[PDB]
Design a protein around this ligand. Structure first.
Ligand SMILES: Nc1ccn([C@H]2C[C@H](O)[C@@H](COP(=O)(O)CP(=O)(O)OP(=O)(O)O)O2)c(=O)n1
Ligand SMILES: [Cl-]
Ligand SMILES: [Cl-]
Ligand SMILES: [Mn+2]
Ligand SMILES: [Mn+2]
Ligand SMILES: [Mn+2]
Ligand code: NA
Ligand code: NA
Length: 326
DNA sequence: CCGACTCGCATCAGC
DNA sequence: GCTGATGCGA
DNA sequence: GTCGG
């Protein structure tokens, strides 16, 4: 928390550039700066001191000087006051509403939560569910509740087919004391890079979790990726638990390690590692690490028997999940 | 300076 | 219908 | 917005 004011400012600027300006490289630039400063173990006293960190440049350094001097950033103070910016920033907080839809809605005069409720007719299915659970999706998940959810998911999967392996990833696997959502990596021996010998492998699981009233809604669903909503059961006379977002990714069993690396993250950690892989002549996705040939075209998948094998190829020391929270 | 900065699903445009 | 782009998301 | 080359 040494530099919370600064990292908050950069995050707000990042969000502005994504949601309002639609400038995703600026969003990523601010995100990278905020991350590098967040792990900096000194209380930053100057923009010049910050500029020594990779990803902090001259423009961010100047903003840090303004913020250190005054506790504020004029540029943000005015963004906070501009009506369309603030309306756009709000609407993108609904799952399924991005910068595009948010601006179109603001264009048609839909700019408040009440406006959206009045105009449910104009939302696609994802957006309608995001609106329904807007309040619940603001609440974080205590790790203790993550553990109960894990119990349910693992046991329910076992009951569909004992050969399923389900792994909770994301911030949970990084050891976070609370999470924004639950991410589940799924594998089954009938689904490898070489063949899919059983159909419906993800569907069967979604169905089982629906039938025990754990999964309550679906935002998107295909053959390998589910995105929806779930809820812990509550005890007699207790208030219901908040509804929670859940993502499930079925990964070819032989590609578990690249999959678990991807799904564990963080997002920024993945972004940095994939970028470093490129510097080193490889490309990494959730399935494989491949070398880049003399012309920048991916070659054949290299053998991988461990998360560390991936770190090895790109000449990074192994980092435990808990140390990947960038 | 200047080019560069992985993929799944839903939806749409075009045919 | 399919294919490719875009939006939104992990 | 940043930065390797
Ligand atoms: N732009 C992105 C977004 C996500 N991912 C991967 C890495 C991330 O940890 C995982 C879960 O995403 P989530 O969106 O669930 C974020 P997570 O790290 O689980 O933290 P929480 O906020 O507590 O949920 O998906 C990626 O590679 N690139
Ligand atoms: Cl940009
Ligand atoms: Cl691949
Ligand atoms: Mn998560
Ligand atoms: Mn998630
Ligand atoms: Mn609820
Ligand atoms: Na720097
Ligand atoms: Na959104």
């Amino acid at each position: 928390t040494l530099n919370g004011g600064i990292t908050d400012m950069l995050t707000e600027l990042a969000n502005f550039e994504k949601n309002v300006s639609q400038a995703i490289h600026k969003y990523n630039a601010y995100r990278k700066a905020a991350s590098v400063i967040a792990k900096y173990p000194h209380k930053i006293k100057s923009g010049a001191e910050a500029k020594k960190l990779p990803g902090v440049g001259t423009k961010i350094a100047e903003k840090i000087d303004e913020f250190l001097a005054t506790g504020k950033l004029r540029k943000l103070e005015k963004i906070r006051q501009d009506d369309t910016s603030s309306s756009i920033n709000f609407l993108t907080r609904v799952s399924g509403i991005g910068p595009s839809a948010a601006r179109k809605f603001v264009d048609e005069g839909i700019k408040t939560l009440e406006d959206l409720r009045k105009n449910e007719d104009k939302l696609n299915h994802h957006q309608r569910i995001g609106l329904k659970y807007f309040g619940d999706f603001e609440k974080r998940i205590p790790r203790e509740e993550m553990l109960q959810m894990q119990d349910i998911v693992l046991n329910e999967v076992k009951k569909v087919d004992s050969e399923y392996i389900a792994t909770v990833c994301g911030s949970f696997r990084r050891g976070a004391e609370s999470s924004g959502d639950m991410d589940v990596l799924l594998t089954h021996p009938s689904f490898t890079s070489e063949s899919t010998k059983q159909p419906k492998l993800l569907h069967q699981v979604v169905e089982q979790l629906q039938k025990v009233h754990f999964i309550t809604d679906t935002l998107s669903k295909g053959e390998t990726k589910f995105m929806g909503v779930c809820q812990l059961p509550s005890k007699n006379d207790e208030k219901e638990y908040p509804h929670r977002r859940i993502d499930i990714r079925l990964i070819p069993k032989d590609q578990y390690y690249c999959g678990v690396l991807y799904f564990t993250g963080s997002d920024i950690f993945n972004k940095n590692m994939r970028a470093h892989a490129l510097e080193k002549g490889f490309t990494i996705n959730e399935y494989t690490i491949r070398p880049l040939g003399v012309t920048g075209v991916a070659g054949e998948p290299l053998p991988v028997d461990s998360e560390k094998d991936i770190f090895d190829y790109i000449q990074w020391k192994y980092r435990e999940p808990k140390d990947r929270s960038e």
